[PDB]
CSV table of C-alpha atoms in Angstrom, one decimal:
chain,number,residue,atom,x,y,z
P,1,UNK,CA,0.0,0.0,0.0
P,2,UNK,CA,2.8,2.4,0.8
P,3,UNK,CA,4.6,1.6,-2.5
P,4,UNK,CA,1.4,2.3,-4.4
P,5,UNK,CA,1.1,5.5,-2.4
P,6,UNK,CA,4.5,6.9,-3.4
P,7,UNK,CA,4.6,6.7,-7.1
P,8,UNK,CA,8.0,8.4,-7.4
P,9,UNK,CA,10.8,5.9,-8.2
P,10,UNK,CA,13.5,8.0,-6.6
P,11,UNK,CA,12.0,7.1,-3.2
P,12,UNK,CA,12.7,3.4,-2.4
P,13,UNK,CA,11.3,1.5,0.6
P,14,UNK,CA,13.3,-0.9,2.7
P,15,UNK,CA,12.9,-4.5,1.6
P,16,UNK,CA,11.2,-7.0,3.9
P,17,UNK,CA,13.0,-10.1,5.1
P,18,UNK,CA,11.3,-13.4,4.8
P,19,UNK,CA,10.7,-13.7,8.5
P,20,UNK,CA,9.3,-10.1,8.7
P,21,UNK,CA,6.6,-10.6,6.0
P,22,UNK,CA,3.9,-12.3,8.1
P,23,UNK,CA,4.3,-10.0,11.1
P,24,UNK,CA,1.1,-8.2,12.3
P,25,UNK,CA,0.5,-4.5,12.8
P,26,UNK,CA,-2.4,-2.3,13.5
P,27,UNK,CA,-3.7,0.2,10.9
P,28,UNK,CA,-6.0,3.2,11.2
P,29,UNK,CA,-9.8,2.9,10.8
P,30,UNK,CA,-10.1,4.9,7.6
P,31,UNK,CA,-7.2,6.4,5.5
P,32,UNK,CA,-6.8,10.1,4.8
P,33,UNK,CA,-7.1,10.6,1.1
P,34,UNK,CA,-7.9,13.7,-1.1
P,35,UNK,CA,-11.6,13.1,-0.2
P,36,UNK,CA,-11.2,14.5,3.3
P,37,UNK,CA,-8.9,17.4,2.2
P,38,UNK,CA,-11.5,18.5,-0.4
P,39,UNK,CA,-14.1,19.1,2.4
P,40,UNK,CA,-12.0,21.8,4.1
P,41,UNK,CA,-12.4,24.3,1.2
P,42,UNK,CA,-14.5,26.8,3.1
P,43,UNK,CA,-11.7,27.5,5.6
P,44,UNK,CA,-8.6,26.6,3.5
P,45,UNK,CA,-7.6,30.1,2.7
P,46,UNK,CA,-6.8,30.9,6.4
P,47,UNK,CA,-4.6,27.7,6.6
P,48,UNK,CA,-2.7,28.6,3.5
P,49,UNK,CA,-2.1,32.1,4.6
P,50,UNK,CA,-0.9,31.1,8.0
Z,1,UNK,CA,10.6,-33.4,13.8
Z,2,UNK,CA,7.5,-34.9,15.6
Z,3,UNK,CA,8.9,-34.9,19.1
Z,4,UNK,CA,9.2,-31.2,20.2
Z,5,UNK,CA,8.0,-27.8,19.1
Z,6,UNK,CA,9.5,-25.7,16.3
Z,7,UNK,CA,11.8,-24.0,18.8
Z,8,UNK,CA,12.7,-26.8,21.3
Z,9,UNK,CA,13.9,-28.7,18.3
Z,10,UNK,CA,16.1,-25.8,17.3
Z,11,UNK,CA,17.6,-25.6,20.8
Z,12,UNK,CA,18.2,-29.4,20.9
Z,13,UNK,CA,20.0,-29.2,17.5
Z,14,UNK,CA,22.2,-26.4,18.8
Z,15,UNK,CA,23.1,-28.4,21.9
Z,16,UNK,CA,23.8,-31.5,19.8
Z,17,UNK,CA,26.0,-29.4,17.4
Z,18,UNK,CA,28.0,-27.9,20.3
Z,19,UNK,CA,28.5,-31.3,22.0
Z,20,UNK,CA,29.6,-32.9,18.7
Z,21,UNK,CA,32.0,-30.1,18.0
Z,22,UNK,CA,33.5,-30.3,21.5
Z,23,UNK,CA,33.7,-34.1,21.3
Z,24,UNK,CA,35.5,-34.9,18.1
Z,25,UNK,CA,37.4,-31.8,16.8
Z,26,UNK,CA,39.6,-29.4,18.6
Z,27,UNK,CA,38.3,-25.9,19.2
Z,28,UNK,CA,38.3,-23.6,16.2
Z,29,UNK,CA,36.0,-21.1,14.5
Z,30,UNK,CA,33.4,-23.2,12.6
Z,31,UNK,CA,32.7,-20.6,9.9
Z,32,UNK,CA,29.4,-22.2,8.8
Z,33,UNK,CA,28.2,-22.5,12.4
Z,34,UNK,CA,28.8,-18.8,13.1
Z,35,UNK,CA,27.2,-17.9,9.8
Z,36,UNK,CA,24.1,-19.9,10.7
Z,37,UNK,CA,24.0,-18.4,14.3
Z,38,UNK,CA,24.3,-14.8,13.2
Z,39,UNK,CA,21.5,-14.6,10.7
Z,40,UNK,CA,19.0,-16.8,12.4
Z,41,UNK,CA,16.6,-13.9,12.8
Z,42,UNK,CA,16.3,-13.3,9.1
Z,43,UNK,CA,14.5,-16.6,8.6
Z,44,UNK,CA,11.1,-17.9,9.8
Z,45,UNK,CA,11.5,-20.7,12.3
Z,46,UNK,CA,10.1,-23.5,10.1
Z,47,UNK,CA,12.3,-22.9,7.1
Z,48,UNK,CA,15.3,-22.3,9.4
Z,49,UNK,CA,14.7,-25.7,11.0
Z,50,UNK,CA,14.4,-27.3,7.5
Z,51,UNK,CA,17.6,-25.8,6.4
A,1,UNK,CA,34.9,-2.1,-1.9
A,2,UNK,CA,33.4,-5.3,-0.4
A,3,UNK,CA,30.0,-4.5,-1.8
A,4,UNK,CA,31.3,-3.6,-5.3
A,5,UNK,CA,33.4,-6.9,-5.3
A,6,UNK,CA,30.3,-8.9,-4.4
A,7,UNK,CA,28.1,-7.1,-7.0
A,8,UNK,CA,30.6,-8.2,-9.7
A,9,UNK,CA,30.1,-11.9,-9.0
A,10,UNK,CA,26.5,-12.8,-8.2
A,11,UNK,CA,24.8,-11.7,-11.5
A,12,UNK,CA,21.8,-10.7,-9.4
A,13,UNK,CA,23.1,-8.6,-6.5
A,14,UNK,CA,23.6,-5.3,-8.4
A,15,UNK,CA,24.1,-2.2,-6.2
A,16,UNK,CA,21.0,-0.2,-5.3
A,17,UNK,CA,21.6,3.6,-4.8
A,18,UNK,CA,19.9,5.4,-2.0
A,19,UNK,CA,19.5,9.1,-2.9
A,20,UNK,CA,19.3,11.9,-0.3
A,21,UNK,CA,16.0,12.6,1.3
A,22,UNK,CA,13.7,15.6,0.5
A,23,UNK,CA,16.4,17.5,-1.4
A,24,UNK,CA,16.2,17.7,-5.1
A,25,UNK,CA,18.9,19.0,-7.5
A,26,UNK,CA,21.2,20.2,-4.8
A,27,UNK,CA,24.6,21.3,-6.3
A,28,UNK,CA,26.5,18.3,-4.8
A,29,UNK,CA,24.0,15.8,-6.2
A,30,UNK,CA,24.7,16.9,-9.8
A,31,UNK,CA,28.5,16.4,-9.5
A,32,UNK,CA,28.2,13.2,-7.6
A,33,UNK,CA,25.9,11.8,-10.3
A,34,UNK,CA,28.4,12.9,-12.9
A,35,UNK,CA,31.2,11.1,-11.1
A,36,UNK,CA,29.1,8.0,-10.8
A,37,UNK,CA,28.2,8.2,-14.5
A,38,UNK,CA,31.8,8.4,-15.8
A,39,UNK,CA,33.6,6.4,-13.1
A,40,UNK,CA,31.4,3.4,-12.0
A,41,UNK,CA,30.9,0.6,-14.5
A,42,UNK,CA,27.3,0.2,-15.8
A,43,UNK,CA,27.0,-3.5,-15.3
A,44,UNK,CA,27.5,-3.2,-11.6
A,45,UNK,CA,24.4,-1.1,-11.1
A,46,UNK,CA,20.7,-1.8,-11.0
A,47,UNK,CA,18.4,-0.6,-13.8
A,48,UNK,CA,16.6,1.7,-11.4
A,49,UNK,CA,19.9,3.4,-10.2
A,50,UNK,CA,21.1,3.8,-13.8
A,51,UNK,CA,17.8,5.4,-14.8
A,52,UNK,CA,17.9,7.9,-11.9
A,53,UNK,CA,21.5,8.8,-12.7
A,54,UNK,CA,20.7,9.2,-16.4
A,55,UNK,CA,17.6,11.3,-15.6
A,56,UNK,CA,19.7,13.7,-13.3
A,57,UNK,CA,22.3,14.0,-16.1
A,58,UNK,CA,19.8,14.6,-18.9
A,59,UNK,CA,17.7,17.1,-16.9
A,60,UNK,CA,20.2,19.9,-17.4
A,61,UNK,CA,20.8,19.4,-21.2
A,62,UNK,CA,17.3,18.9,-22.6
A,63,UNK,CA,15.9,22.0,-24.3
A,64,UNK,CA,12.4,21.6,-23.0
A,65,UNK,CA,12.0,18.7,-20.5
A,66,UNK,CA,12.7,19.4,-16.8
A,67,UNK,CA,13.7,17.0,-14.0
A,68,UNK,CA,10.1,16.3,-13.0
A,69,UNK,CA,9.0,15.9,-16.6
A,70,UNK,CA,11.8,13.3,-17.0
A,71,UNK,CA,11.0,11.4,-13.8
A,72,UNK,CA,7.4,11.3,-15.0
A,73,UNK,CA,8.6,9.0,-17.8
A,74,UNK,CA,8.4,6.1,-15.4
A,75,UNK,CA,5.2,4.9,-17.0
A,76,UNK,CA,4.9,4.3,-20.8
A,77,UNK,CA,8.3,2.5,-20.6
A,78,UNK,CA,10.5,0.3,-18.4
A,79,UNK,CA,13.5,1.4,-16.4
A,80,UNK,CA,16.0,-0.2,-18.7
A,81,UNK,CA,14.3,1.1,-21.8
A,82,UNK,CA,14.3,4.6,-20.5
A,83,UNK,CA,17.9,4.3,-19.6
A,84,UNK,CA,18.7,3.1,-23.1
A,85,UNK,CA,16.8,6.0,-24.6
A,86,UNK,CA,18.6,8.6,-22.5
A,87,UNK,CA,22.0,7.1,-23.1
A,88,UNK,CA,21.4,7.0,-26.9
A,89,UNK,CA,20.4,10.7,-26.6
A,90,UNK,CA,23.7,11.4,-24.8
A,91,UNK,CA,25.8,9.9,-27.7
A,92,UNK,CA,24.4,11.9,-30.6
A,93,UNK,CA,26.0,14.5,-32.8
A,94,UNK,CA,25.3,17.2,-30.2
A,95,UNK,CA,26.3,15.6,-26.9
A,96,UNK,CA,28.9,13.0,-26.0
A,97,UNK,CA,29.5,11.5,-22.6
A,98,UNK,CA,31.9,8.6,-21.7
A,99,UNK,CA,29.6,6.3,-19.6
A,100,UNK,CA,32.4,4.1,-18.3
A,101,UNK,CA,31.7,0.4,-19.0
V,1,UNK,CA,70.3,-4.7,-34.0
V,2,UNK,CA,72.1,-7.5,-32.1
V,3,UNK,CA,71.7,-9.5,-28.9
V,4,UNK,CA,72.1,-6.3,-26.9
V,5,UNK,CA,68.7,-5.2,-28.1
V,6,UNK,CA,66.9,-8.0,-26.3
V,7,UNK,CA,67.8,-7.2,-22.7
V,8,UNK,CA,64.5,-5.5,-21.6
V,9,UNK,CA,62.4,-8.4,-22.8
V,10,UNK,CA,64.9,-10.8,-21.2
V,11,UNK,CA,64.4,-9.0,-17.9
V,12,UNK,CA,60.6,-9.2,-18.3
V,13,UNK,CA,60.6,-12.9,-18.8
V,14,UNK,CA,63.1,-13.4,-16.0
V,15,UNK,CA,60.9,-11.4,-13.6
V,16,UNK,CA,57.8,-13.4,-14.6
V,17,UNK,CA,59.7,-16.7,-14.1
V,18,UNK,CA,61.0,-15.6,-10.7
V,19,UNK,CA,57.6,-14.5,-9.5
V,20,UNK,CA,56.2,-17.9,-10.5
V,21,UNK,CA,58.9,-20.1,-8.9
V,22,UNK,CA,58.8,-18.0,-5.8
V,23,UNK,CA,55.2,-19.1,-5.3
V,24,UNK,CA,55.2,-22.7,-6.5
V,25,UNK,CA,57.4,-23.7,-3.6
V,26,UNK,CA,56.0,-21.3,-0.9
V,27,UNK,CA,54.2,-23.2,1.8
V,28,UNK,CA,50.4,-23.1,2.0
V,29,UNK,CA,49.3,-22.0,5.5
V,30,UNK,CA,45.6,-21.2,5.8
V,31,UNK,CA,44.4,-18.7,8.2
V,32,UNK,CA,41.4,-18.9,10.6
V,33,UNK,CA,38.4,-16.9,9.6
V,34,UNK,CA,37.1,-14.5,12.3
V,35,UNK,CA,35.2,-11.2,12.8
V,36,UNK,CA,31.9,-12.5,11.3
V,37,UNK,CA,28.7,-10.8,12.8
V,38,UNK,CA,25.5,-9.2,11.7
V,39,UNK,CA,26.4,-5.5,11.7
V,40,UNK,CA,24.7,-4.2,8.5
V,41,UNK,CA,21.7,-2.4,9.8
V,42,UNK,CA,19.9,0.2,7.7
V,43,UNK,CA,18.5,3.4,9.1
V,44,UNK,CA,16.1,6.0,7.8
V,45,UNK,CA,12.9,7.8,8.8
V,46,UNK,CA,9.8,5.9,9.7
V,47,UNK,CA,6.3,6.2,8.1
V,48,UNK,CA,4.3,7.1,11.2
V,49,UNK,CA,0.8,6.8,9.8
V,50,UNK,CA,-1.5,9.7,10.7
V,51,UNK,CA,-5.2,9.3,11.6
O,1,UNK,CA,51.7,36.0,6.9
O,2,UNK,CA,51.3,34.7,10.4
O,3,UNK,CA,47.5,34.7,10.5
O,4,UNK,CA,47.3,33.2,7.0
O,5,UNK,CA,49.6,30.4,8.0
O,6,UNK,CA,47.8,29.7,11.3
O,7,UNK,CA,44.4,29.5,9.6
O,8,UNK,CA,45.7,27.3,6.8
O,9,UNK,CA,47.2,24.9,9.3
O,10,UNK,CA,44.2,24.9,11.6
O,11,UNK,CA,41.7,24.2,8.8
O,12,UNK,CA,43.9,21.4,7.4
O,13,UNK,CA,44.2,19.1,10.4
O,14,UNK,CA,40.5,19.6,11.1
O,15,UNK,CA,39.6,17.8,7.9
O,16,UNK,CA,41.9,14.9,8.7
O,17,UNK,CA,40.5,14.6,12.2
O,18,UNK,CA,36.9,14.7,10.9
O,19,UNK,CA,37.8,12.0,8.3
O,20,UNK,CA,38.7,9.5,11.0
O,21,UNK,CA,36.0,10.6,13.5
O,22,UNK,CA,33.5,9.6,10.8
O,23,UNK,CA,35.0,6.1,10.8
O,24,UNK,CA,34.9,5.9,14.6
O,25,UNK,CA,31.2,7.0,14.6
O,26,UNK,CA,30.4,4.5,11.9
O,27,UNK,CA,32.0,1.8,14.0
O,28,UNK,CA,29.9,2.8,17.1
O,29,UNK,CA,26.7,2.9,15.0
O,30,UNK,CA,27.1,-0.8,13.7
O,31,UNK,CA,27.3,-1.8,17.4
O,32,UNK,CA,24.5,-0.7,19.8
O,33,UNK,CA,25.4,2.8,21.1
O,34,UNK,CA,24.8,6.1,19.2
O,35,UNK,CA,22.1,4.2,17.1
O,36,UNK,CA,21.2,4.8,13.5
O,37,UNK,CA,19.3,7.9,12.2
O,38,UNK,CA,21.8,10.2,14.0
O,39,UNK,CA,23.7,11.4,10.9
O,40,UNK,CA,24.9,15.0,10.3
O,41,UNK,CA,24.3,16.8,7.1
O,42,UNK,CA,26.3,20.0,7.0
O,43,UNK,CA,29.5,20.7,8.9
O,44,UNK,CA,31.2,24.1,8.9
O,45,UNK,CA,34.6,24.9,10.2
O,46,UNK,CA,35.5,28.6,11.1
O,47,UNK,CA,39.1,29.6,11.8
O,48,UNK,CA,40.3,32.9,13.1
O,49,UNK,CA,44.1,32.7,13.6
O,50,UNK,CA,44.8,30.1,16.2
O,51,UNK,CA,41.3,29.8,17.5
O,52,UNK,CA,38.8,27.7,15.6
O,53,UNK,CA,35.3,26.3,15.9
O,54,UNK,CA,33.3,23.3,14.5
O,55,UNK,CA,29.6,23.2,14.0
O,56,UNK,CA,27.6,20.1,12.9
O,57,UNK,CA,23.9,20.1,12.1
O,58,UNK,CA,21.4,17.2,12.5
O,59,UNK,CA,17.9,16.4,11.3
O,60,UNK,CA,16.9,14.5,14.5
O,61,UNK,CA,18.6,15.9,17.6
O,62,UNK,CA,20.5,13.1,19.5
O,63,UNK,CA,19.7,12.7,23.1
O,64,UNK,CA,21.9,14.0,25.9
O,65,UNK,CA,24.2,11.0,26.3
O,66,UNK,CA,24.6,10.7,22.6
O,67,UNK,CA,26.2,14.2,22.5
O,68,UNK,CA,28.7,13.1,25.2
O,69,UNK,CA,29.6,10.0,23.4
O,70,UNK,CA,30.2,11.7,20.0
O,71,UNK,CA,32.1,14.6,21.6
O,72,UNK,CA,34.3,12.2,23.4
O,73,UNK,CA,34.8,10.2,20.2
O,74,UNK,CA,35.8,13.4,18.3
O,75,UNK,CA,38.1,14.6,21.0
K,1,UNK,CA,24.8,26.2,-14.4
K,2,UNK,CA,28.2,24.7,-15.4
K,3,UNK,CA,30.4,25.9,-18.3
K,4,UNK,CA,31.0,23.3,-21.1
K,5,UNK,CA,34.7,23.5,-20.3
K,6,UNK,CA,34.3,22.1,-16.8
K,7,UNK,CA,33.7,18.5,-17.9
K,8,UNK,CA,36.9,17.7,-19.7
K,9,UNK,CA,38.8,18.6,-16.6
K,10,UNK,CA,36.6,16.2,-14.6
K,11,UNK,CA,37.3,13.4,-17.0
K,12,UNK,CA,41.0,14.2,-16.9
K,13,UNK,CA,41.1,13.9,-13.1
K,14,UNK,CA,39.3,10.6,-13.1
K,15,UNK,CA,41.9,8.8,-15.2
K,16,UNK,CA,43.7,5.6,-13.9
K,17,UNK,CA,47.5,5.4,-13.8
K,18,UNK,CA,49.4,2.3,-15.1
K,19,UNK,CA,50.7,1.1,-11.7
K,20,UNK,CA,47.3,1.6,-10.2
K,21,UNK,CA,45.9,-0.6,-13.0
K,22,UNK,CA,48.6,-3.3,-12.3
K,23,UNK,CA,47.7,-3.3,-8.6
K,24,UNK,CA,44.0,-3.5,-9.5
K,25,UNK,CA,44.6,-6.5,-11.7
K,26,UNK,CA,46.8,-8.5,-9.4
K,27,UNK,CA,44.2,-8.8,-6.6
K,28,UNK,CA,41.4,-9.7,-9.0
K,29,UNK,CA,43.5,-12.3,-10.7
K,30,UNK,CA,44.3,-14.0,-7.4
K,31,UNK,CA,40.6,-13.7,-6.4
K,32,UNK,CA,38.9,-15.1,-9.5
K,33,UNK,CA,40.9,-18.3,-9.4
K,34,UNK,CA,40.0,-19.3,-5.9
K,35,UNK,CA,36.4,-18.4,-5.0
K,36,UNK,CA,33.9,-21.2,-5.6
K,37,UNK,CA,31.8,-20.6,-8.7
K,38,UNK,CA,28.8,-22.7,-7.7
K,39,UNK,CA,27.4,-19.8,-5.6
K,40,UNK,CA,27.3,-17.3,-8.4
K,41,UNK,CA,23.6,-18.2,-9.0
K,42,UNK,CA,22.6,-17.5,-5.4
K,43,UNK,CA,19.6,-15.1,-5.1
K,44,UNK,CA,20.2,-12.1,-2.8
K,45,UNK,CA,19.2,-12.3,0.8
K,46,UNK,CA,19.7,-9.7,3.6
K,47,UNK,CA,19.3,-6.8,1.2
K,48,UNK,CA,21.3,-4.3,3.3
K,49,UNK,CA,24.4,-6.1,1.8
K,50,UNK,CA,23.9,-4.4,-1.6
E,1,UNK,CA,55.2,-42.8,-1.5
E,2,UNK,CA,56.7,-39.4,-1.2
E,3,UNK,CA,59.1,-39.7,-4.1
E,4,UNK,CA,56.3,-41.0,-6.4
E,5,UNK,CA,54.5,-37.7,-6.7
E,6,UNK,CA,55.8,-35.6,-9.5
E,7,UNK,CA,53.2,-32.9,-9.3
E,8,UNK,CA,55.1,-29.6,-9.4
E,9,UNK,CA,58.5,-29.9,-7.8
E,10,UNK,CA,61.5,-32.3,-7.9
E,11,UNK,CA,61.6,-34.1,-4.6
E,12,UNK,CA,64.9,-35.7,-3.7
E,13,UNK,CA,65.5,-38.0,-0.7
E,14,UNK,CA,68.7,-39.7,0.2
E,15,UNK,CA,68.8,-43.5,0.7
E,16,UNK,CA,68.0,-44.1,4.3
E,17,UNK,CA,70.1,-47.1,5.6
E,18,UNK,CA,70.2,-50.9,5.2
E,19,UNK,CA,68.9,-51.3,8.7
E,20,UNK,CA,66.6,-48.2,9.3
E,21,UNK,CA,64.1,-49.4,6.7
E,22,UNK,CA,61.7,-51.2,9.1
E,23,UNK,CA,61.3,-48.3,11.5
E,24,UNK,CA,57.7,-47.5,12.2
E,25,UNK,CA,56.0,-44.1,12.4
E,26,UNK,CA,52.4,-42.8,12.5
E,27,UNK,CA,51.0,-40.6,9.7
E,28,UNK,CA,47.2,-40.0,9.5
E,29,UNK,CA,45.3,-39.2,6.3
E,30,UNK,CA,41.7,-37.9,6.3
E,31,UNK,CA,39.3,-39.7,3.9
E,32,UNK,CA,36.1,-37.7,3.7
E,33,UNK,CA,34.5,-36.3,0.6
E,34,UNK,CA,34.5,-32.5,0.5
E,35,UNK,CA,32.0,-32.1,-2.4
E,36,UNK,CA,28.9,-32.0,-0.2
E,37,UNK,CA,29.6,-28.5,1.1
E,38,UNK,CA,29.6,-26.9,-2.4
E,39,UNK,CA,25.9,-27.6,-3.1
E,40,UNK,CA,23.4,-24.9,-4.0
E,41,UNK,CA,22.2,-23.5,-0.6
E,42,UNK,CA,19.7,-20.8,0.2
E,43,UNK,CA,22.4,-19.0,2.2
E,44,UNK,CA,25.2,-18.9,-0.3
E,45,UNK,CA,25.0,-15.1,-0.6
E,46,UNK,CA,26.1,-14.8,3.0
E,47,UNK,CA,29.0,-17.2,2.3
E,48,UNK,CA,30.2,-15.1,-0.6
E,49,UNK,CA,29.9,-11.8,1.3
E,50,UNK,CA,31.7,-13.0,4.4
Y,1,UNK,CA,59.9,-6.8,-32.7
Y,2,UNK,CA,58.6,-10.1,-31.3
Y,3,UNK,CA,58.2,-11.2,-27.7
Y,4,UNK,CA,55.8,-8.8,-25.8
Y,5,UNK,CA,55.3,-6.1,-28.4
Y,6,UNK,CA,52.0,-4.2,-28.4
Y,7,UNK,CA,50.0,-6.9,-26.6
Y,8,UNK,CA,51.3,-7.3,-23.0
Y,9,UNK,CA,49.9,-7.0,-19.5
Y,10,UNK,CA,50.1,-3.5,-17.9
Y,11,UNK,CA,52.2,-5.2,-15.2
Y,12,UNK,CA,55.2,-5.3,-17.5
Y,13,UNK,CA,55.1,-1.5,-18.2
Y,14,UNK,CA,56.7,-0.8,-14.8
Y,15,UNK,CA,59.9,-2.6,-16.0
Y,16,UNK,CA,60.1,-0.7,-19.2
Y,17,UNK,CA,59.5,2.7,-17.7
Y,18,UNK,CA,62.4,2.3,-15.3
Y,19,UNK,CA,65.2,3.1,-17.9
Y,20,UNK,CA,63.4,6.2,-19.2
Y,21,UNK,CA,62.8,7.4,-15.7
Y,22,UNK,CA,66.5,6.9,-14.9
Y,23,UNK,CA,67.6,8.8,-18.0
Y,24,UNK,CA,65.2,11.6,-17.2
Y,25,UNK,CA,67.2,12.4,-14.0
Y,26,UNK,CA,70.6,13.0,-15.4
Y,27,UNK,CA,71.5,16.6,-14.5
Y,28,UNK,CA,70.7,18.4,-17.7
Y,29,UNK,CA,67.4,17.0,-18.8
Y,30,UNK,CA,65.4,18.9,-16.3
Y,31,UNK,CA,63.4,20.9,-18.8
Y,32,UNK,CA,61.5,17.8,-20.1
Y,33,UNK,CA,61.2,16.1,-16.7
Y,34,UNK,CA,59.2,19.0,-15.2
Y,35,UNK,CA,56.9,19.2,-18.2
Y,36,UNK,CA,56.3,15.5,-17.9
Y,37,UNK,CA,55.6,15.5,-14.2
Y,38,UNK,CA,53.3,18.6,-14.4
Y,39,UNK,CA,51.0,17.5,-17.3
Y,40,UNK,CA,50.7,13.8,-16.7
Y,41,UNK,CA,46.9,13.7,-16.7
Y,42,UNK,CA,46.5,15.0,-20.2
Y,43,UNK,CA,49.4,13.1,-21.7
Y,44,UNK,CA,49.9,9.8,-19.9
Y,45,UNK,CA,53.1,7.8,-19.8
Y,46,UNK,CA,51.8,5.1,-22.3
Y,47,UNK,CA,51.5,7.3,-25.3
Y,48,UNK,CA,54.8,9.1,-24.6
Y,49,UNK,CA,56.5,5.7,-24.5
Y,50,UNK,CA,54.8,4.6,-27.7
Y,51,UNK,CA,55.9,7.9,-29.4
């Protein structure tokens, strides 16, 4: 998911060892995409200026 | 492989290797033994035991 | 030295270059890329590293395309194919670079 | 153009021959491999998912 | 030319000291001490006659005992 | 920006001397003839080594 | 046995004695095949690097 | 002519260069010697020796 996130080839992500592939982590409930950012338009000007 | 767990078998194999090394041959370096020991965390336990 | 010696034997352990973080086209990056281009043999590097080096080199010589416009060529072609295109562009009648092999 | 014009090549051949026979007879004493460990960690900045 | 000579000599051995301090720091990093991710980016040396100073910048600031370890290694 | 004349100097300073070449070749010649060749097909593991 | 080998060097040994021939002495010789270590292993990259 | 002409290992060049280096330090050839040791990187020893 992170690799698909960062489309730039200059960035390269650490490779995973065989023993580290099946390890388990906790992810967030819902991801932050452009959808959420589009909904802050009425107040975006203040944030940009500051 | 049907007597212990996936980790007790590894420990038993290590003990057997150390015993055999101290029984027959004089003390040395055992290049392969140290190579196996150092990178044992880069492999899952099952395939490490198989290897 | 050890890594370069290993990369010349295994046929599949080619060196992978890690570029500096969140700094693009700093003055030292350009000269370091040039040194890599004309001092490090091409067969000891990965296709990705060769493509990045070639992109940095070709950014400053192209009449129109910029660095971002060149890195955007990741799609529509492979890494090795883009590297070959750029290298052929750098051995034309207008530009000539060694590219140590 | 005589035998005096073949001295440099003679010295080259003699040097090569001496280098060879100084190594054919030299004893073979193998060393003991040491300093083998896992010391190739890789750093960098984490991802630190926001939410 | 006394000041010129002093500042030329002072700025010369500083580079040769930093060269080997980098090796010692890399040695400590592969073992468990200073830890990875504590790598400087810009180092500036300023010389005024005999007296001189050395400034190194970091992206993530090392903790207090890291500073002591690296300063001891450099000295 | 760099002047077109700054490259030929860079190529000139990167040249390799003859004695340097001889010392380069000696070590490689004594290394190619001793390392086992059956491991040249090995797939890479522990990526930090490359 | 020593004189028989003509591999690379000229070995010369003086005749011992008419009466010192039957003297006994211990000399061991390992007999174990060494070709089973050079198999294709999943860890050969580590061997090459080290 | 024969015996290690234009196709020899770069190892052998050290032997050949010795005589020229010795002659270039004979108290009266100093003009050429400085020119040689100042502009080596543009005109390396191999082409000078061939010329």
